[PDB]
Design a protein around this ligand. Structure first.
Ligand code: HEM
Ligand code: HEM
Ligand code: HEM
Ligand SMILES: [Zn+2]
Ligand SMILES: [Zn+2]
Lengths: 106, 106, 106
């Protein structure tokens, strides 16, 4: 997918999570987030087009999606286990990851 | 691209790390491995074609490559600071993750 | 080698990061944490001595351990970038992962 569509999917589904009624809905938003973050991994952002793929910038760029995928995964488990409230909390906190990569490369 | 191709890339570069000349050939081969493993992220292996993308088997499957990439990133950091022998050792012990997944899904 | 020992190394270097002045001191302490975590993550802890390597309990433990490994990586990136203060904030931010895993498995 386009990086840009991948982020819309991240943004949209996080909101779906903040507003969810039950576990089924959070878990579904999390899955979709996982899909998008997995796909984004290999993307080159506009701000790093003049950067070599094996370069520190692209290295740290990729790692951002690694972290996010692990967090979504942890959060996805809380959801599977029916823990709506804490799943929503994990979901929240992975925003720090969105910001960390955003501050730098967006 | 293909799951098959990704594995050939994995296998080849593991041999490339074992024979490595210097830090850079080690780093370059590890980079290729991470990109191949992330390409495989969302591939669907023959043995799990009957299984829902939301099943424990696929969960287990995608998670392997996440562990792997992590292990690769860790080796990469060893190489970055010029501990080639140590980076080469982690690429050896990195086979435990390969095997773990083949055992279940190949 | 053993969990205990690596956990001390982990504990001690976080207090070294909190008391650090320069980016290099943070980088080294994070590097020692990287190393402790590299040698620890696959151990079975006292409280899961009964459960086997591929249960839900060991899978969760390994993941949170990998989350931790991934936050040390992020923090190490920030240090190489010489962003001293935000490497430290990231070393702080990683106490929650420490805590999430102790709360289930210590
Ligand atoms: C779930 C967490 C995340 C959310 C909610 C999020 C949200 C967004 C949104 C809404 C945009 C569009 C901004 C615009 O309208 O111009 C965007 C763009 C972007 N994001 Fe994220 N993001 C997340 C995680 C990440 C991560 C982890 C990375 C890097 C590893 C990243 C890298 C980027 C980049 C480079 C752009 C610019 C896209 C472009 O200009 O083509 N984002 N993100
Ligand atoms: C760097 C470590 C790894 C190496 C060197 C490696 C190597 C290989 C090789 C040589 C094959 C032979 C199949 C062929 O080429 O036709 C294969 C197949 C396969 N591997 Fe891996 N592998 C690794 C890691 C993994 C991991 C981590 C997973 C799961 C997370 C995995 C899942 C599979 C599956 C499902 C197949 C069978 C697919 C097919 O035949 O279409 N492998 N691998
Ligand atoms: C920076 C992060 C962490 C710090 C500073 C830390 C610190 C410590 C300390 C001080 C101990 C007690 C050691 C002793 O008195 O022998 C300990 C033990 C332990 N830690 Fe951590 N820890 C961290 C992260 C983690 C993580 C991520 C996990 C699992 C994923 C984990 C699992 C355990 C377990 C199971 C023990 C019990 C060992 C025993 O008493 O046998 N820790 N840790
Ligand atoms: Zn899991
Ligand atoms: Zn790195």
């Amino acid at each position: 997918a386009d990086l840009e569509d991948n982020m819309e999917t991240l943004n949209d589904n996080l909101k779906v999570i903040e507003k969810a009624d039950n576990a089924a809905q959070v878990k579904d938003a999390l899955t979709k987030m996982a899909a998008a973050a997995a796909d984004a991994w290999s993307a080159t952002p506009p701000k790093l087009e003049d950067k070599s793929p094996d370069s520190p910038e692209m290295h740290d760029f990729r790692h951002g999606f690694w972290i996010l995928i692990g967090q979504i995964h942890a959060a996805l488990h809380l959801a599977n286990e029916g823990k709506v409230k804490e799943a929503q909390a994990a979901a929240e906190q992975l925003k720090t990851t969105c910001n960390a990569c955003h501050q730098k490369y967006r």
